[PDB]
């Protein structure tokens, strides 16, 4: 069940999020601090 899942999520790479998608994504770490930024900013975090 692990091999099938990894093959399917790698056949469809958009499952990995925009950061790890790889057509110009910033990266896992960069998205990590970006989500930190969003977490501190109230406008991007809540509906407002």
């Amino acid at each position: 069940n692990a091999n099938v899942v990894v093959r399917l999520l790698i056949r469809r790479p958009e499952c990995f999020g925009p950061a790890l998608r790889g057509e110009g994504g910033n990266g896992l770490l960069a998205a990590m601090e970006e989500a930190i930024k969003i977490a501190e900013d109230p406008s991007r975090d809540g509906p407002s």
């Binding site: 093959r7 790698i10 056949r11 790479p13 998608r21 790889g22 057509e23």
Partner: protein, 394 residues
């Protein structure tokens, strides 16, 4: 009866590229010595720019089942979908593979596709999967069928990437449809007869003089002329010509009388052509138009009705024989005949004349694979070394 593609046959892998809302067919190409990385050269613009199929042709080595290949890696059939094929580059003799390295121009998952000396390892083997729902695993591979390839080692798809500024081939999980068109079949080839893509020598009636270019004095502007010389020139690499047909598919079929073809000097890479002054002159690949670079062999010098026969998808009849057959060459449009000046290391110039001399017979002598490969390597080294010298001079 629809043909089925098979090993020991020579094929080109074609993929479609949609640029400016227009589809351009491209064959997977890779120059053996030098750049191991594969690339694409246009095959849709054959009229304006000749395609170099010598680096686009591949040979199917073996088609083993998944179980058999796994077992043997642990240690004239018929293709079926679900097999793994071994593609060997006809010119270089090296095998297509996933290089396991990545330029990472788009993403980190995709790897580069190149050529490998050694077959051992799962990189060289590529599994054929049916890209059409009308095809199932175990079905016979069709000539007109469209294919998708999966690498055994990487489990990526042979993918043409539009994301790069230039069209590129990479092993990616995105899949791209690859159409494979036959060039020739080895079994049906007849020994001693001219076929498309051969490297050959144009030998005059006496065998003594051969059509060639001036000796190398480091100037292409003066190398561009063509004439007849004899002696060591016959065994040298300046008198080797490649007869390239005008059709992309079945280009390795037996050449027929009155068949349009283009001649390319192997050492210089320029294509034989006719200028407005009715004098032959070599010109570059980019501006080698079909209306200036196309010639036809004819059995008799007199104006027999050549006619038009519909081109067929097969090896065909062996109308021209090496040495035995006597050929007469003319331009397709003007119809003049290639002939000597009649004014003579003969160093007699060759001209394009309407009625031509009586002794304009040129036979055909086939060159060996080693000698053709040496000339190709010579040209590919001259180009690179001249680039290097020009860079140092700048």
């Amino acid at each position: 009866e629809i043909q089925f593609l098979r090993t020991d046959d020579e094929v080109v892998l074609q993929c479609t590229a949609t640029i400016h809302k227009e589809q351009q067919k491209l064959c997977l190409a890779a120059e053996g010595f030098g750049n191991r990385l594969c690339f694409l050269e246009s095959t849709s613009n054959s009229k304006n720019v000749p395609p170099d199929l010598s680096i686009c042709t591949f040979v199917l080595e073996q088609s083993l089942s998944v179980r058999a290949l796994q077992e043997m890696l642990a240690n004239h059939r018929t293709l079926l979908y679900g097999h793994a094929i071994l593609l060997r580059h006809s010119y270089s003799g090296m095998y297509l593979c996933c290089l396991s390295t990545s330029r990472s121009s788009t993403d980190k998952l995709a790897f580069d596709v190149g050529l490998q000396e050694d077959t051992t390892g799962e990189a060289c083997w590529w599994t054929i999967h049916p890209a059409s729902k009308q095809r199932s695993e175990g079905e016979k591979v069709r000539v007109g069928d469209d294919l998708i390839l999966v690498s055994v080692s990487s489990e990526r798809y042979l993918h043409l990437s539009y994301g790069n500024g230039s069209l590129h081939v990479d092993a990616a999980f995105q899949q791209t449809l690859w159409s494979v068109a036959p060039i020739s079949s080895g079994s049906e080839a007849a020994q001693g007869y001219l076929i498309g893509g051969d490297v050959l020598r144009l030998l005059h009636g006496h065998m003594d003089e051969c059509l060639t270019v001036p000796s190398g004095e480091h100037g292409e502007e003066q190398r561009r002329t063509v004439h007849y010389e004899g002696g060591a020139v016959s065994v040298h690499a300046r008198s080797l010509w490649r007869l390239e047909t005008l059709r992309v598919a079945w280009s390795g079929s037996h050449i027929r009388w009155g068949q349009p073809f283009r001649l390319r000097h192997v050492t210089t890479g320029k294509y034989l052509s006719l200028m407005e002054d009715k004098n032959l002159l070599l010109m570059d690949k980019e501006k080698a138009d079909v209306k200036s670079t196309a010639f036809t062999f004819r059995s008799s010098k007199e104006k027999l009705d050549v006619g038009v026969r519909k081109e067929v998808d097969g090896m065909g009849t062996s109308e021209i024989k090496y040495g035995d057959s006597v050929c007469y060459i003319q331009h397709v449009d003007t119809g003049l005949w290639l002939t000597y000046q009649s004014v003579d290391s003969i160093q007699r110039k060759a001209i394009m004349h309407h009625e031509g001399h009586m002794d304009d017979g040129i036979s055909l002598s086939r060159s060996q694979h080693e000698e053709s490969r040496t000339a190709r390597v010579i040209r590919s080294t001259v180009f690179l070394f001249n680039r290097f010298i020009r860079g140092l001079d700048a």
